[model samples]
Target: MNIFEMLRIDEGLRLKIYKDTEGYYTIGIGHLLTKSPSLNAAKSELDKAIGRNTNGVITKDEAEKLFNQDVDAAVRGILRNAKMKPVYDSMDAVRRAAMINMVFQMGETGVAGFTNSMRMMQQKRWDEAAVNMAKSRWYNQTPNRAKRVITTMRTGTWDAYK
Candidate 1:
């Protein structure tokens, strides 16, 4: 199963992904400073939710989590998808999901031109959303994840958790 296909991934369990030319990141479930056991549990749970199918060969959950940790630490924080839409409704699932991945991982405000993305979204520019998504420093840094996610959003066939 891929990250998208994993069950038990209620919104509460999902972390947003982010990029910054360094790499991608997501909120650490909760930060150590303000440790939210639920967040920690959610990280482990998300990993478990996605990593079980590798037969122990693929990257483990902790590594993935740690890698994503730096990604999240780089950004700030804000309300997630639930709140973003009011600011911009044109965002599709892929763009919204990717944005959340970054926002949750990085923080919507920290993401460069976040305001512009929202504006474009309000105008219903999905193609622009893809361009906007790719334009981010993180997108440049983590091409693999960005490309896959963008493609997923475009096709609406993403199945990472599956």
Candidate 2:
């Protein structure tokens, strides 16, 4: 599947700005928009990202560009770790995509704590890795997405979201 399709399943498709789970300004498929925090911190970033001053209604074309950039940055963030470099290189495309999605959810530092799961993934112990992944606080926080991610990692195929 395409990156946009993957992200739509994971991040939810939206053409407008909104506050995310952490109350941060987000828009266009989970992009953490940044701008001067003066003109209303929550909304200004969305306006800035879309090159507008009001009604952050991003067109599909703009959203697609933002999505591509966000996904690229997420993948780059996943690959930034020296320890994860070899592991990432060892994974197939699906596994690599899963790792990128994990980074998007947890940030690189948060994901770094999943050492056992990462090792299991690198070793191709799919079931063990999935189990380890499910046994996390993240799973408790978002069971449905976690299940989908774990299934995708274990099976190397897209698991339908519930």
Candidate 3:
């Protein structure tokens, strides 16, 4: 029901480098390695955190560390985003968690493109918001993950975790 657990399940915890649904290099519970400005910069950070050569393998603890950092970044990004902050603050705990998870899956920039969905969610039009969420490339990219969050947005409950 919490953001961490929700993200862990949605992302499918991985200790090795792998391709995400969109074929991006990702690791450690959806941590996008391609986010780094440079590949070397990314490898150095990962190596420093995992205390191992950037050999594409890491321990659970290291992955968790990365996950923690990622969650913080996502939360901050959501709060920092001008429009989403208002919509995010208007949401309840479950809805807020759902939004946070969505932001985690696709960074604040990506979700910002959901202009219609944001407006619907802000208006407390839960069904309309869910529809907006469903009718997107993001939904097509990962229906299973997106569906659960949409369910939360609609019901304003943690049933999606079921």
Candidate 4:
């Protein structure tokens, strides 16, 4: 599976508006309403996706489109950070997914703040990297999500690990 598969799990699939952990209005696989071009544009996108005016409800296909855009934006955001771009490139698929998930959630600037974690991840030091990731407010707020992503970072794998 792609990184978005993990993202969907972490973000959850809400067809209607819901308050995110950061207290922003989010919908449809964690797309923040604030990021929308406009309310009417958002509704129009939904209307196109579902073939009608959705009244804030989106179908799974609509949600998937939003999810793909967010994933692309996050990847682009990561690449824009010069330091992270190389590290992201050096990573394998699984490790890259871990970083992508972090960037997806926190934005590249937020992930860039993890100085030690960045170095550790760049060096392919999975255990140390995971430890560094835990030493953060991100972990404090999203401990469960952090744990899952961190485990993937540590093991460099996902699903059927047993």
Query: For this target, which candidate reaches the highest TM-score against the unseen true structure?
Result: 3
Cα-based TM-score, every candidate: 0.44, 0.85, 0.90, 0.84
Can you write out model 3's per-residue Cα lDDT over 3-83, one digit (the tens) per residue? 899888899888877778877667788888775445566666667767779677788888899999989998999998998
Q: Give the deviation of candidate 4 from the true structure as CA RMSD.
A: 3.5
TM-score, structure 1 vs. true:
0.44
Better of 3 and 4 by lDDT: 3
Off by over 4 Å in 1: 1-95, 159-162
lDDT of 1 by residue, 43-69 (tens): 554456445532212243544564455
Q: What TM-score, to 2 decimals, does candidate 3 have? A: 0.90
Report how far off residue 16 is in candidate 1 (Å). 21
Q: Candidate 4 at 130: error in angstroms? A: 1.1
lDDT of each: 0.46, 0.77, 0.85, 0.82
Between prediction 1 and prediction 2, the one with superior TM-score is 2
lDDT of 2 by residue, 1-162 (tens): 855577678787677776666666677787776433432664666676667765666877777777888788777876778877778899988878778888877778888889999899899999999988998999998888888778878988865543
Candidate 4 lDDT, tens digit per residue, 27-121?
88887765554666666655665577778787788888888988998888888888889888888899889889898888777888998888888
Ranking by TM-score: 3, 2, 4, 1
